[PDB]
Amino acid sequence: KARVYPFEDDVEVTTGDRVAPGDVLADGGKVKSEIYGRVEVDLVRNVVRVVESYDI
Amino acid sequence: DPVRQYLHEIGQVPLLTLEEEIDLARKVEEGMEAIKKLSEATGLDQELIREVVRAKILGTARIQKIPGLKEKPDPKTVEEVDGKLKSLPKELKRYLHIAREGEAARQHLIEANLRLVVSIAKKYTGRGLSFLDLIQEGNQGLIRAVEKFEYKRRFKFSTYATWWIRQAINRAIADQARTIRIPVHMVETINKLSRTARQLQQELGREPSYEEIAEAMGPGWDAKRVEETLKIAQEPVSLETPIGDEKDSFYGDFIPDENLPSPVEAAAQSLLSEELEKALSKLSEREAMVLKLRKGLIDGREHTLEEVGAYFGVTRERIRQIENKALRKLKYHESRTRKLRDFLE
DNA sequence: CTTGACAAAAGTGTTAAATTGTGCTATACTGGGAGCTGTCACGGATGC
């Protein structure tokens, strides 16, 4: 259960990082994830996904 | 129950297929070499950004928070590094993420073949570590074999891993074993000897004499060598060993304390001290005081002829003959009075 | 009590021989293991 947010250039975040609605994952401050979760960065497929996970 | 605990804790994850195996090793080595190329980037060392990978992966500050009061500075040697490569172009960043996923791969790998370790060490019970203890040390063996293995070798990781398991296990028991610490090579030769002893005990149809077994060993091995290391073999016997036919009869309280003085000894020492103290005044006022040095009385430390000579302004030879005449004058008083005739041991 | 001479006890410097600590081994080894009894009384937590 997750929501994909494929980027274009570089990245702001890394594999394993907590985010909330209104955050910029990647894309030089373009793409914006709205939900709580641990972001995971997949290089090849070029995507940073937000799984629904509360940091607890 | 902590035993069956880990027993169900290991089976919580599948082991692996050949595919998954090779893939694991793949992203592992690619990750590590990515760390290499990263070491060429900002000028960081080889092992630096590696443990830093653990800093941002294995968790939050919890990793370096309490590795003793000293391990390595977190806010100083780590923090800036975490932010130093964040400023870097696409290449160094992709290498970064490669490092992350790679190390994670190392972990998963480790857990599977940890199931394997569990079996292996499960066969070694009775070494002085009941189950888990043993197993745990054994486990870390695999860990060292994890980073030293190459997928290129086309070998099932179980092999390499296994040998390293028996490595960690045998080194651990060599370094723990009996309550008395023993050097590794020593333990080696020990179990070596007992090996031989076993074998020819079964072959000869009886226990060997020291010389024939020691000969069965080889050159320079004699009865005295085996008897020696055999004396070292046996460990300290527990004080809690119950003796007799009852529960209440113990061992530990049956040991005499000679390390401390005894009332008879206290008064004996005090006696020699006092009786000699009054026997002091019957000597020449100079030669008595001098005698207190040469025999190490005054400060407890014996002063040489040169020092006592440097005391009374007399040559050391003077002090020497002083000692002769003093000890002999005292000898007259002794051979006469017969007071201190005791203390003859 | 004294000066020089000298033997031995003792001090120190440098090495050879021993002792000890370390790393690694590649076919493939991938979820233990051992059992034990013939009370009894009460206090407390806990499952009915």
UniProtKB/Swiss-Prot annotation, chain A:
It comes from the Bacteria. The RNAP catalytic core consists of 2 alpha, 1 beta, 1 beta' and 1 omega subunit. When a sigma factor is associated with the core the holoenzyme is formed, which can initiate transcription. DNA-dependent RNA polymerase catalyzes the transcription of DNA into RNA using the four ribonucleoside triphosphates as substrates. Belongs to the RNA polymerase beta' chain family. This is DNA-directed RNA polymerase subunit beta'. The chain holds residues 397 to 452 of 1524 of the full protein.
UniProtKB/Swiss-Prot annotation, chain B:
A motif (Interaction with polymerase core subunit RpoC) lies at residues 133-136. GO terms for molecular function: DNA binding; sigma factor activity. The keyword Lipid biosynthesis does not apply. Residues 279-331 are annotated as: Sigma-70 factor domain-4. Residues 109-179 are annotated as: Sigma-70 factor domain-2. One of its GO terms (cellular component) is cytoplasm. Interacts transiently with the RNA polymerase catalytic core formed by RpoA, RpoB, RpoC and RpoZ (2 alpha, 1 beta, 1 beta' and 1 omega subunit) to form the RNA polymerase holoenzyme that can initiate transcription. Belongs to the sigma-70 factor family. RpoD/SigA subfamily. Contains 4 domains, connected by flexible linkers. In the active conformation, the domains are in an extended conformation, each making extensive interactions with the RNA polymerase catalytic core. In the autoinhibited state, sigma-70 factor domain-1 packs closely together with sigma-70 factor domains-2 and -4, contrary to the extended conformation that is seen when the protein is part of the RNA polymerase holoenzyme. This is RNA polymerase sigma factor SigA. The chain holds residues 94 to 438 of 438 of the full protein.
